[PDB]
């Protein structure tokens, strides 16, 4: 039948890509990094503690000013903190009570939230009466929302559990382009610092590089053995790292199109929930379900001080744009800022 | 000049914590419930007893708040959004009493989940009358789906409603003990199940939920004091 020949030529394409990539691999990145000098131990304690949430924390996002951060909890509340004064700023109630994601505008004028309601809500913070109200609600996703990332003041990229990623358009309420390439629930995504390309990881153990300009799958990155729950870019923009539930963290290069290093350890067994990089890229962070976060190095596996300050499962974390300090989130409704 | 921003954020903080404690008083006094069922399980009747990806129904029973959440419009993938329900009071399970083995496999997965441990399960065996008539005529009996049904016997603690078929008591207790075999296996003393016998006309299912929720909170309070 036609399904047989289409499947057969599909496998032949997988082979010729793999053979071309295998011929492309000349020297593992571990070999070229054999002459580098390890940084050592950068063990550091927490600086600030943030309290005020009722239920577990699922997501957070940092601000461009590297001072404002917003988190979401199952109680139906959005809280924008102050990393310096520790004093809360805004308290946004939610119509639903099962939010599973959060975001932050590049200019600080917008936030995002989504969950089991299958509707992404955009809240405008710079209103005219000094209060907070929802600006636009986006409906059309069949499944729950899992990750949102603002590209600019007009368009937003949201990933839902309907196996499709969408590029919405505020002030219109309709989708512009849809990325129907995944065969599993999409968990997290991140955008490169050029508002042109972004990668998205789903529950099909594959991270796909999309293009918002044409709405097609530019490249596909594989290597993980379980569902991908975290993803982040290298500061240069030509590389990105992922994180799955198999206690493995891998580094991918947009030009190599294959895994380079696996930042895994035999002691860690729980899955990763959130990853991030440093300003210079000479570091690596990855959350875990064993109540603490590990610190690595991009050039080679160099275990630094473990950021162990949480009681429940770590579900979200981030790094400031200036790279001065980092933040972490956990299900104990507690947020800490490590520097 | 810089202190005014501080007192502004402090005043903004207190007015935020005031509303947080205001909503905490109703959040701690609300017993959220997860209404879960299978395809054509008859769970709509429970909703009517008193698009969007989830439904809500706020009903009070003797100054007690119960919040049921119905999963509507979500795909069959449950391994990701079932983790959000690790803080509810109980997960109401609806079965269409092979459409029965899948309910047992879904109950087993929820029971043995790593986050959904510590949450109890309220089981409702709906379609009790429809199942009773079909086993009475004998056109489609459940031995094809359960070969051990012949070797099963009526429990000593059976309470058959008078006039119920000698066969319906065998059927309702067999399905009841099927879920008990799963709950008692992984049960370490943190969450229990309360199977019930729900018909298509009985309106006392709301009273059953109140009694099970009372047992859940009582066992939780006993566990905090290490008494039980």
């Amino acid at each position, epitope marked *: 039948s036609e399904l047989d020949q289409l499947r057969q030529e599909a496998e032949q394409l997988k082979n010729q890509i793999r053979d071309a990539r295998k011929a492309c691999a000349d020297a593992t990145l571990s070999q070229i990094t054999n002459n580098i000098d390890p940084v050592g131990r950068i063990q550091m304690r927490t600086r600030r503690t943030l309290r005020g949430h009722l239920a577990k924390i699922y997501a957070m996002h940092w601000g461009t000013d590297s001072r404002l951060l917003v988190s979401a909890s199952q109680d139906g509340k959005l809280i924008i903190w102050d990393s310096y004064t520790t004093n809360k700023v805004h308290a946004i109630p939610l119509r639903s009570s099962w939010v599973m994601t959060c975001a932050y505008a590049p200019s600080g004028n917008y936030v995002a939230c989504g969950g089991l309601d299958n509707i992404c809500s955009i809240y405008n913070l710079k209103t005219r009466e000094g209060n907070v109200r929802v600006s636009r609600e986006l409906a059309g996703h069949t499944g729950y929302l899992s990750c949102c990332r603002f590209l600019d003041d007009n368009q937003i990229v949201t990933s839902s559990g309907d196996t499709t990623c969408a590029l919405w358009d505020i002030e219109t309420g309709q989708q512009t382009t849809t990325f129907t390439g995944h065969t599993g629930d999409v968990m997290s995504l991140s955008l490169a610092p050029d508002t042109r390309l972004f990668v998205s990881g789903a529950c*099909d153990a594959s991270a796909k590089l999309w293009d918002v300009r044409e709405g097609m799958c530019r490249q596909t990155f594989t290597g993980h053995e379980s569902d991908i729950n975290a993803i982040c870019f290298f500061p240069n923009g030509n590389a990105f790292a992922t994180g799955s539930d198999d206690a493995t963290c891998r580094l991918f290069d947009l030009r190599a199109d294959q895994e380079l290093m696996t930042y895994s350890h035999d002691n860690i067994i729980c899955g990763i929930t959130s990853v991030s990089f440093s300003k210079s890229g000479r570091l690596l962070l990855a959350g875990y379900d064993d109540f603490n976060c590990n610190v690595w190095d991009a050039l080679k596996a160099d275990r630094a001080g473990v950021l162990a300050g949480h009681d429940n499962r770590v579900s979200c974390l981030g790094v400031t744009d200036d790279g001065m300090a980092v933040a972490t989130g956990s299900w104990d409704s507690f947020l800490k800022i490590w520097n | 000049d810089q202190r005014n921003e501080e007192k502004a954020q402090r005043e903004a903080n207190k007015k935020i914590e005031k509303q947080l404690q205001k909503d905490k008083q109703v959040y701690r006094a609300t017993h959220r419930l997860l209404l879960l069922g299978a395809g054509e399980s008859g769970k709509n009747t429970i909703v009517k007893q008193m698009t969007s990806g989830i439904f809500e129904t706020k009903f009070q029973v003797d100054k007690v708040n119960f919040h049921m959440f119905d999963v509507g419009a979500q*795909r*069959d*993938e449950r391994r990701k959004w079932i983790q959000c329900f690790n803080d509810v009071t109980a997960i109401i399970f609806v079965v269409a009493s092979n459409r029965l*083995q899948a309910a047992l496999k879904l109950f087993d997965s929820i029971w043995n989940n790593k986050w959904l441990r510590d949450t109890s399960v309220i089981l409702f065996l709906n379609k009790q009358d429809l199942l009773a008539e079909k086993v009475l005529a004998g056109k489609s009996k459940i031995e094809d789906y359960f070969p051990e049904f012949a070797r099963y016997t009526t429990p000593e603690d059976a309470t058959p409603e008078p006039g119920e078929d000698p066969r319906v008591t065998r059927a309702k207790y067999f399905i009841r003990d099927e879920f008990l075999r799963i709950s008692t296996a992984s049960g370490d003393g943190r969450h229990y199940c309360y199977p019930h016998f729900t018909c298509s006309v009985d309106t006392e299912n709301i009273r059953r939920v109140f009694n099970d929720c009372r047992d859940i909170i009582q066992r939780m309070h006993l566990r905090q004091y290490e008494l039980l």
Partner: nanobody
Amino acid sequence: QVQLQESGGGLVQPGGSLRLSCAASGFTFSNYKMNWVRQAPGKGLEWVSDISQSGASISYTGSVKGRFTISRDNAKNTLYLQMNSLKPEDTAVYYCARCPAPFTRDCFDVTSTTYAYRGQGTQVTVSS
């Protein structure tokens, strides 16, 4: 690359035993709980069997608990499902599924209509 391919199957006479395979690659075969599902024509997916990591926890569907027999080989990274005396009720394509989260006693979404960690269907037609 996570991929599962199954073998065996075909037209079998009633009362004839048949065996199936499930070759797994791209991951650790020993650190996952593998399961089976069936898709009867004009019906939905139905769970058939499963097996734990080592092989201690093994369950089968009540509909055919006795005749079916499952086994796995962690060293060779291949799993085998043995079926004896096939009945007309078993004329369904069998898909090799794979539980996503490792080191878990539970397993969600085994019989979902659309699943990533699940191979193709091996047709097993039971007819005269």
